[PDB]
Structure formats: C-alpha cells, structure tokens
Design a protein around this ligand. Sequence first.
Ligand SMILES: Nc1ncnc2c1ncn2[C@@H]1O[C@H](C[C@@H](N)CC[C@H](N)C(=O)O)[C@@H](O)[C@H]1O
Length: 271
Amino acid sequence: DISDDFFALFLDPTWVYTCAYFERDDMTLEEAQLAKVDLALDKLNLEPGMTLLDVGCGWGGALVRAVEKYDVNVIGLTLSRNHYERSKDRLAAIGTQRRAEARLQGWEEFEENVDRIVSFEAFDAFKKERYLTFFERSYDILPDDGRMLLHSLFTYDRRWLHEQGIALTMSDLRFLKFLRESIFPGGELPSEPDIVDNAQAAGFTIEHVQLLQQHYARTLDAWAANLQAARERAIAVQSEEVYNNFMHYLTGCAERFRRGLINVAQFTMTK
Ligand SMILES: Nc1ncnc2c1ncn2[C@@H]1O[C@H](C[C@@H](N)CC[C@H](N)C(=O)O)[C@@H](O)[C@H]1O
C-alpha cells in the first residue's frame, strides 16, 4: 500500500531495503549496500554462468549486482507486485547475454535446479511452520556442492537477553505490538535456533555466521535521516500518519539494534 515513490525518498539507488555493510567507515549508503550484497555473494563462490536464485528479491538490487559484477544468470522470487515490477524492469535494462528473470512466485512453488541461493531478510516473512520446509526445498534444488547465503534477522528471548545484561522494557513490548500491527517487519522474528537447527536438519552445514547488528543500527539511522530530510515530499506521497509511522519504525528499530535486543546475520550454509 506504500508507493515506491515513498521508499525512493529514503533508499539509495540500489533500492536495497535490508541491513547494509559499512565495510569501510566512510562508505556512502549505496556503497555499503553493494558491500553487503558483495559480502554475501563472495561467500557463494560464484563463477560466471552459474545460476543464482534470490529468494525474496525486493526491488532487484542484489539481482542486478549479481549480473553486473559476478556475470551470473539470475532468478529472483517475490510475492510483492511492486517488487516484481521494478526487478523485472531493472533486469531487462541490464545489457547481458545471461538469463535474468524476476518472478511473482513464492519459493514454495519454485522447484528448478539452481547452483547457489541467496536471500536477504525474507526468512522472517515466512511462517514458522515453513522454516524446515524452506531449508528442505533449498537443499533439494542445490547441487551436491551447492551453497546458500541466508541473511536473516533473528531475535533473542528474555533469558538469553538477561544473561547478556539486557532487559525488555514495557516500551519494547509496545514497540513489538506496533510492529505486528503495521506493515513493518520484526513482529514475528525467528530465533537463531529456528534458523540453525532447521537448516542442519535439512542437511546443511553452517560454515560461518557473520553478525551485522551495529551495521543495521547505522543503516536504520541513515534511512531515518534521509526520510526526515524529505519529510514534506514523503507526506505528499503518503501522509503525515505514514511518515510518522515510518520514522517510529526506523528510529525504534535502530535503537533496539544498538541495545542488542535483536540481531541480523549472514549464515553461510553448505552441503
Ligand atoms: N514465500 C516467499 N517466497 C518468495 N518471496 C517472498 C516470500 N515471502 C516474502 N517474500 C518476498 O521477500 C521479500 C522481503 C524483503 N524484506 C527482502 C528485501 C530484499 N531482499 C532486499 O535486500 O532489499 C519481499 O520481496 C517479499 O515479497
């Protein structure tokens, strides 16, 4: 229900809407988003001509980067029409002899063999009842030496937080309720075991876990700063209610990454 024109006011030109990676401290938002995509794609050991699946591809930035820098064939899946349309157009506009396609299709319906899989903050949009099924499907469509890079948010429970010196406040519970009752992610995040245990049961080895908690804090701060700087135009595209809701989500989430209440990581998964 939120127009691309609203998101365009605060995202960088890649349209990437997930945790960036400030590999160098002076990177711009765009450089840090490309660095996050490259950080993940480098872990897949892509050779030109391989086929990469991006599960939950958003507006196509990682797919475009994969084609341009890694010279791979690409398939992107999304359930959002707006994500599909922009991904479709952007991929068609790349000059490449490779196959590059976006699809309005869920991973549940995708059964084609691919060489490698990437996914950036789609897994939290899956129902917990599909966590194992997702890893089983991913394992099935990969070759014997296949690799998956799962970039996913995840949460911590009260006990673990407490052991780390962190408490959930009444305000945090209200913020979680706000997330669930909104168009924003973070309401029903998986735990780390939800990711690791189900991946391992499907047959994957967790070769590496790279946490990006403080990179997300910085990313969210940048989105919030951009949106506030374009407040009038954002209100015109949507409304003051929506603008304030987004600022609440962006700054509230940034605060909570800094505090350590949740995390985001890249899981390198091998067969
Ligand atoms: N079962 C599903 N299968 C495929 N895509 C899904 C599924 N559920 C949600 N999605 C898509 O996952 C994406 C979630 C986004 N947060 C991912 C953003 C994108 N990967 C980025 O880095 O900017 C959206 O494009 C959803 O439409």
